[PDB]
């Protein structure tokens, strides 16, 4: 189980096919392999899963053009909303 | 034939009616609004 989970983005680039660095953060128990997604409309991320067993935070990678868009990113079942400023490639 | 026989007589009875009604009523009105 993962609790609270917060999303802190780092980079954003319009360029199609991935850029930017999303990094989720949480506290969890027992830990196993957690899945990842993006429930939003657009804004995807190349990474189906990440693993928590270490008892630490996670890191991820994503895509999307939008100058600044938000998207809901789940982590196993927990969720959150991400967003950030952007820049052209 | 029943389409040609009915259509011809359709405007035939109406021909001798409207044709004679307008020819008699107008002839009567012409003879009445003149003899008076």
């Amino acid at each position: 189980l993962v609790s609270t989970v917060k999303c802190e983005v780092s980079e954003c680039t319009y360029s199609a096919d991935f850029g930017g660095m999303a990094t989720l953060q949480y506290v969890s128990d027992r830990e196993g392999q957690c899945p990842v997604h993006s429930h939003s409309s657009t804004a995807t991320l190349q990474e189906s899963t990440v693993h928590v067993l270490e008892k630490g935070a996670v890191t991820v990678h994503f895509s999307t053009a939008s100058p600044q868009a938000n998207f809901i990113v789940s982590l196993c079942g927990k969720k959150t909303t991400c967003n950030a400023e952007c820049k052209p490639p | 034939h029943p389409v040609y026989t009915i259509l011809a007589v359709a405007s035939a009875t109406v021909a001798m009616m409207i044709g004679v009604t307008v020819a008699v009523l107008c002839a009567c009105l012409a003879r009445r609004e003149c003899l008076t």
Binding site: - | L29, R32, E33, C34, L35, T36
Partner: protein, 151 residues
């Protein structure tokens, strides 16, 4: 020999005349003949002459007006005064004839009818009349001056 034609309000809007065997009135005068018998007769329109007629009942045929086509230039008379006939036209003074006068006869010095008034044309100085007359052969004629208003 002259009867009132009344509107629904009872007002006189014109006249009907017993002359030469029949009752006659101007067609444009839309009302009821003020008479128990004549109001129940079915009239025959003579539209080209703005007239409408019916045969007079036997009792009225006696003293019906006599019509004459012989009416040389000079002075005639009608209900409102002297009428002048000259150059083929019957004229009366301005401001004398009007609403309700359609149907009235123009009479000569022998009590004969010379014309039937349909309306008139105010020509500033005199009023020219629109009239129904008949020629020697008894043919109907309708003379209408420009500017004629059907009373």
């Amino acid at each position: 020999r002259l009867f009132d034609v009344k509107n629904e309000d009872g007002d006189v809007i014109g006249h009907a005349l017993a002359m030469e065997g029949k009752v006659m009135k101007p067609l444009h005068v839309k009302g009821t003949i003020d008479h128990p018998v004549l109001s129940k007769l079915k009239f025959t329109k003579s539209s080209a002459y703005d007239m409408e007629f019916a045969q007079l009942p036997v009792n009225m045929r006696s003293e019906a007006f006599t019509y004459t086509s012989e009416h040389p230039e000079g002075f005639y008379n009608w209900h409102h005064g002297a009428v002048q006939y000259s150059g083929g036209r019957f004229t009366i003074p301005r401001g004398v004839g009007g609403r309700g006068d359609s149907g009235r006869p123009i009479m000569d010095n022998s009590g004969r009818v010379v014309a039937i008034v349909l309306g008139g044309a105010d020509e500033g100085t005199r009023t020219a009349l629109s009239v129904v007359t008949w020629n020697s052969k008894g043919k109907t004629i309708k003379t209408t001056p420009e500017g004629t208003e059907e009373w």
